[PDB]
Amino acid sequence: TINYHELETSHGRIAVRESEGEGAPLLMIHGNSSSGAIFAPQLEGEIGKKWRVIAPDLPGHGKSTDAIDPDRSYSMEGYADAMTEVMQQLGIADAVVFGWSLGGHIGIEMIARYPEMRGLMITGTPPVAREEVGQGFKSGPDMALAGQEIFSERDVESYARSTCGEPFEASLLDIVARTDGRARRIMFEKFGSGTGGNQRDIVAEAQLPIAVVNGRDGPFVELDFVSKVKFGNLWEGKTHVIDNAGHAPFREAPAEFDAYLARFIRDCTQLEHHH
Numbered sequence: 049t050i051n052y053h054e055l056e057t058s059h060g061r062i063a064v065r066e067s068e069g070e071g072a073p074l075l076m077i078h079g080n081s082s083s084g085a086i087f088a089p090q091l092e093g094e095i096g097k098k099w100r101v102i103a104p105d106l107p108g109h110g111k112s113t114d115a116i117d118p119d120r121s122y123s124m125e126g127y128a129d130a131m132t133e134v135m136q137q138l139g140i141a142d143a144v145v146f147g148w149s150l151g152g153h154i155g156i157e158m159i160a161r162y163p164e165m166r167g168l169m170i171t172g173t174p175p176v177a178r179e180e181v182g183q184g185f186k187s188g189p190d191m192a193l194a195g196q197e198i199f200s201e202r203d204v205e206s207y208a209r210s211t212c213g214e215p216f217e218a219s220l221l222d223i224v225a226r227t228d229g230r231a232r233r234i235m236f237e238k239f240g241s242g243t244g245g246n247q248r249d250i251v252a253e254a255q256l257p258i259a260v261v262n263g264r265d266g267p268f269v270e271l272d273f274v275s276k277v278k279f280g281n282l283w284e285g286k287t288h289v290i291d292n293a294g295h296a297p298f299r300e301a302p303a304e305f306d307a308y309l310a311r312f313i314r315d316c317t318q319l320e321h322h323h
């Protein structure tokens with residue numbers, strides 16, 4: 049049973065899905081033009097059965113309302129503010145955070161705002177300074193869509209297929225089509241204007257465990273670049289790659305992805321802590 053409910057926040061009304069797991073909490077943050085519903089395999093599977101999985105919809109996405117103030121909310125740092133507010137309302141200060149793509153960038157911004165975070169896993173996310181975008185991401189037509197306000201029906205399909213990968217389901221179109229397109233345009237411009245913290249520096253200096261897990265065949269992330277990024281505390285000492293998966297290994301290869309996520313949560317929450 050997934051517990052769905054909505055929170056009135058300063059950013060607007062935020063939809064939240066929670067599993068019924070009694071264990072330590074895991075915040076899962078979805079990507080650009082997605083929603084927390086994308087994390088069905090974790091919410092409804094072994095991860096969500098054990099751990100308290102929380103999968104909200106960002107402002108402008110899914111079942112959340114559009115942002116009260118797009119100029120405040122639609123940016124990596126603005127979304128980080130919104131998710132921090134959500135966690136405060138839920139009374140949870142020490143979640144492990146999993147961020148998918150845009151969600152991973154948001155998670156990086158959350159490090160400063162959510163100091164008791166027990167770990168951060170990023171998938172589909174190259175930590176990059178603004179000038180490093182070409183190094184961290186692969187060039188292509190779906191990539192251009194990341195910052196494009198208006199999607200035709202065909203842009204909806206191309207974007208959904210490239211970002212969500214196999215298997216494609218019609219329900220994915222509904223999610224992408226709903227997205228407030230202003231959020232794409234504004235977030236992308238602000239990323240390029242360096243309005244938030246330098247993500248390269250943030251992850252280099254961050255002391256909490258950061259896990260990096262990607263599909264080998266994703267169309268967006270430069271995996272070699274990611275494997276060279278400096279992290280303060282890289283979980284298991286390397287970046288991890290799942291064969292036969294693209295941008296969304298949590299749905300494309302759930303068992304393999306869940307092995308990493310479960311082990312990371314265990315490591316971050318159930319080992320004796322020494323500074």
Ligand SMILES: CCCCCC(=O)N[C@@H](CCO)C(=O)O
Pocket residue numbers: 078079080081148149150151153172181185190191194211236239268
């Ligand atoms: C080039 C800037 C990318 C910003 C983050 C983003 O939109 N990530 C997408 C993946 C890239 O299309 C996602 O959340 O899936």
